[PDB]
Amino acid sequence: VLSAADKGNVKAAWGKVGGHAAEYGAEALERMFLSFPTTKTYFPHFDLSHGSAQVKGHGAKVAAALTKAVEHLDDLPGALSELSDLHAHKLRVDPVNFKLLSHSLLVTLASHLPSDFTPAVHASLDKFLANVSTVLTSKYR
Amino acid sequence: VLSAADKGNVKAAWGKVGGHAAEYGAEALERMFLSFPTTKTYFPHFDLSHGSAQVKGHGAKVAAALTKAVEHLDDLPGALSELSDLHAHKLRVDPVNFKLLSHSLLVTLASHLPSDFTPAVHASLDKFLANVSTVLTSKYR
Amino acid sequence: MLTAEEKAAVTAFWGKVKVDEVGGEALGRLLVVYPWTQRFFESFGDLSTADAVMNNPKVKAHGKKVLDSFSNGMKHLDDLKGTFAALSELHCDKLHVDPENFKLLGNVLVVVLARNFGKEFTPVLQADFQKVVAGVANALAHRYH
Amino acid sequence: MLTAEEKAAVTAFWGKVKVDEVGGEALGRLLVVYPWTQRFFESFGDLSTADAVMNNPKVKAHGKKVLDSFSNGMKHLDDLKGTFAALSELHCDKLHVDPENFKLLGNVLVVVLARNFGKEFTPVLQADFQKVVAGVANALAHRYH
Ligand code: HEM
Ligand code: HEM
Ligand code: HEM
Ligand code: HEM
Numbered sequence: 210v211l212s213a214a215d216k217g218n219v220k221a222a223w224g225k226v227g228g229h230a231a232e233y234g235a236e237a238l239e240r241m242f243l244s245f246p247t248t249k250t251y252f253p254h255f256d257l258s259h260g261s262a263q264v265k266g267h268g269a270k271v272a273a274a275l276t277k278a279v280e281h282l283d284d285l286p287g288a289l290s291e292l293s294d295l296h297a298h299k300l301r302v303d304p305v306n307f308k309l310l311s312h313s314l315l316v317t318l319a320s321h322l323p324s325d326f327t328p329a330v331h332a333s334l335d336k337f338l339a340n341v342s343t344v345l346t347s348k349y350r
Numbered sequence: 351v352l353s354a355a356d357k358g359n360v361k362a363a364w365g366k367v368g369g370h371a372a373e374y375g376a377e378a379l380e381r382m383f384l385s386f387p388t389t390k391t392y393f394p395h396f397d398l399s400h401g402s403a404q405v406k407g408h409g410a411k412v413a414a415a416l417t418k419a420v421e422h423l424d425d426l427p428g429a430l431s432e433l434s435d436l437h438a439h440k441l442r443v444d445p446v447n448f449k450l451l452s453h454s455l456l457v458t459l460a461s462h463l464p465s466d467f468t469p470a471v472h473a474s475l476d477k478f479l480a481n482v483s484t485v486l487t488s489k490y491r
Numbered sequence: 492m493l494t495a496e497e498k499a500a501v502t503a504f505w506g507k508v509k510v511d512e513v514g515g516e517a518l519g520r521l522l523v524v525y526p527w528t529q530r531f532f533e534s535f536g537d538l539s540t541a542d543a544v545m546n547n548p549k550v551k552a553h554g555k556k557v558l559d560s561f562s563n564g565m566k567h568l569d570d571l572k573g574t575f576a577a578l579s580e581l582h583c584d585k586l587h588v589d590p591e592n593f594k595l596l597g598n599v600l601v602v603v604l605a606r607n608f609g610k611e612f613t614p615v616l617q618a619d620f621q622k623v624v625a626g627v628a629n630a631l632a633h634r635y636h
Numbered sequence: 637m638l639t640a641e642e643k644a645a646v647t648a649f650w651g652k653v654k655v656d657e658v659g660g661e662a663l664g665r666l667l668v669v670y671p672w673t674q675r676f677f678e679s680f681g682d683l684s685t686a687d688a689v690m691n692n693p694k695v696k697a698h699g700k701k702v703l704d705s706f707s708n709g710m711k712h713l714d715d716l717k718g719t720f721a722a723l724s725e726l727h728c729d730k731l732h733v734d735p736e737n738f739k740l741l742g743n744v745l746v747v748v749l750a751r752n753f754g755k756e757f758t759p760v761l762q763a764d765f766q767k768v769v770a771g772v773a774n775a776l777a778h779r780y781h
Contacts, residue, residue, distance in 0.1 A: 636774050
């Protein structure tokens with residue numbers, strides 16, 4: 210459960226990402242399949258080749274989903290229903306995998322925003338992602 | 351996050367516990383200390399002896415917290431504010447410990463309530479104890 | 492691992508466990524309690540509700556097989572790493588089960604035995620048993636360690 | 637672990653890493669990001685805040701020691717089990733650090749390199765690095781498994 214400060218820091222961080230949210234989105238997926246190959250077993254129908262337009266377009270979708278979450282930090286369950294439905298009920302994604310993408314995203318954000326990626330922001334973003342992850346991995350419908 | 355069925359289940363099961371919650375709370379603590387000795391390092395000032403006055407007296411406490419939490423399933427952060435402060439800010443409990451206590455409690459409940467400890471009830475209480483542990487380990491001041 | 496004691500106490504308790512029923516329950520409680528685990532079990536049919544899962548024949552039968560290798564690892568508590576080498580390779584290299592689930596199952600097994608044996612499953616006997624399912628969860632994870 | 641091809645890339649990039657700075661940053665991020673880790677570092681003084689943590693001299697001092705042992709791990713990369721056996725004994729047997737925290741550090745370490753190197757620390761190069769940090773984590777956790 211996030212502080213007022215954590216939600217402050219998440220908003221701040223996400224303004225900076227701004228319009229490269231899709232870009233960072235793609236890069237984090239790209240880093241996750243590379244670093245953690247088992248995650249690929251969830252995308253058997255994907256072009257998982259380096260530079261695949263398919264991975265790029267999906268990162269757009271994932272970042273677009275996170276930006277929705279940043280605007281609805283007080284009711285993530287409500288915002289992310291349709292997405293829990295997918296991740297928990299239909300896809301049945303092992304919880305550890307959400308750790309792997311979260312880490313990846315953090316890696317991504319760090320390398321593009323060294324100045325803004327302060328340890329405090331790091332802490333808040335970490336909490337944010339663990340919160341999103343709990344949502345997509347609970348069956349609450 | 352809890353579904354409406356999860357809340358029902360917890361309410362129902364926590365009710366069946368009724369007047370035996372202090373006892374079970376004590377049994378859970380004994381079982382955690384015994385199986386997972388590293389947890390005892392959080393109680394160096396306690397007599398963790400079999401049948402301790404102090405363990406028993408604590409087990410009453412932790413159960414009365416969970417009874418209150420069961421009455422406030424919609425607002426655990428609001429309900430458990432002071433207990434987060436203690437467990438999160440003051441004692442800085444490594445969250446692995448919360449898992450070991452939640453396991454311990456479930457092992458207790460199963461042995462005392464075999465007919466009532468269904469896999470649906472078992473699932474709902476698991477998620478409930480995960481929610482509580484999140485709050486108690488969160489710094490949302 | 493266990494000592495002479497922890498070992499003979501644990502072995503005795505185990506003689507009282509009906510592997511048929513207890514395996515099916517544990518496997519089913521895994522699938523219901525930690526429902527992402529169902530994704531490994533797609534071929535098993537309908538897993539849509541708790542009753543479906545519990546009553547599923549494929550689950551029970553598989554549960555039986557699970558406890559069998561457990562009884563087995565009880566007969567080889569000394570070398571769990573050797574005992575579980577094939578299953579380690581199958582789960583780890585061919586099914587890609589995150590080792591985190593080995594621990595859940597071991598824990599779910601513990602709660603099952605407590606359910607089935609109530610006070611008989613004493614805090615002291617539960618303890619030696621925790622070392623046992625953690626021993627087992629480590630040997631299977633060996634192709635990750 | 638790594639092939640020759642990967643083991644070279646990892647050694648070249650590591651050559652470019654400023655040990656003073658990176659070790660302290662990673663330790664401090666760890667204390668800041670997973671606040672319960674602070675309980676192992678009470679003696680360390682004021683760890684009330686981010687500013688406090690990051691600017692604590694003992695933190696900075698300790699970070700170095702840590703990165704130093706890592707840099708050594710990077711020299712015995714095929715026998716990390718051996719290279720870390722002492723440290724496994726200390727962290728595990730004496731300190732009682734739960735091994736889940738070793739993953740956290742290695743992960744924090746990865747985010748720090750990426751902060752300090754930006755585009756230089758590529759998807760390709762990070763992947764190889766995650767295998768290192770997992771080995772060192774596994775090696776550190778050796779007294780358990
Ligand atoms: C922060 C965590 C995550 C978020 C926000 C997220 C978000 C999304 C979003 C927005 C979609 C779009 C689907 C649509 O078009 O409606 C999606 C689809 C999907 N997500 Fe995730 N996801 C997350 C984590 C994961 C993880 C860890 C996995 C597996 C490792 C995963 C697997 C999938 C799959 C398999 C799809 C659909 C792929 C397909 O269309 O074939 N998601 N996810
Ligand atoms: C469901 C999880 C938990 C609940 C509901 C809970 C509840 C409580 C309560 C009600 C108190 C003290 C208030 C009082 O004593 O008057 C307390 C204190 C404490 N808790 Fe917890 N606690 C939980 C988890 C833990 C865990 C996992 C640990 C560590 C293994 C822990 C360690 C402590 C310690 C060391 C104290 C203070 C000791 C004392 O006052 O004698 N708590 N907890
Ligand atoms: C201590 C833990 C486990 C033990 C002792 C165990 C044991 C076994 C055994 C004995 C088999 C079948 C052997 C064979 O027919 O060749 C098996 C297969 C399987 N296990 Fe487990 N397993 C364990 C954990 C898991 C976990 C945690 C999962 C997933 C959550 C899992 C999923 C599977 C799957 C999908 C198969 C293939 C089953 C089939 O289609 O027949 N296992 N495991
Ligand atoms: C990659 C993981 C780690 C490495 C390589 C590592 C390495 C070391 C080294 C070299 C020392 C000091 C060696 C010596 O002083 O003889 C040390 C001490 C220590 N480590 Fe770590 N360590 C690691 C992880 C951790 C973690 C995750 C924690 C807790 C969060 C931890 C807690 C400690 C503590 C509490 C000390 C002693 C500090 C004191 O004097 O209070 N270590 N570790």
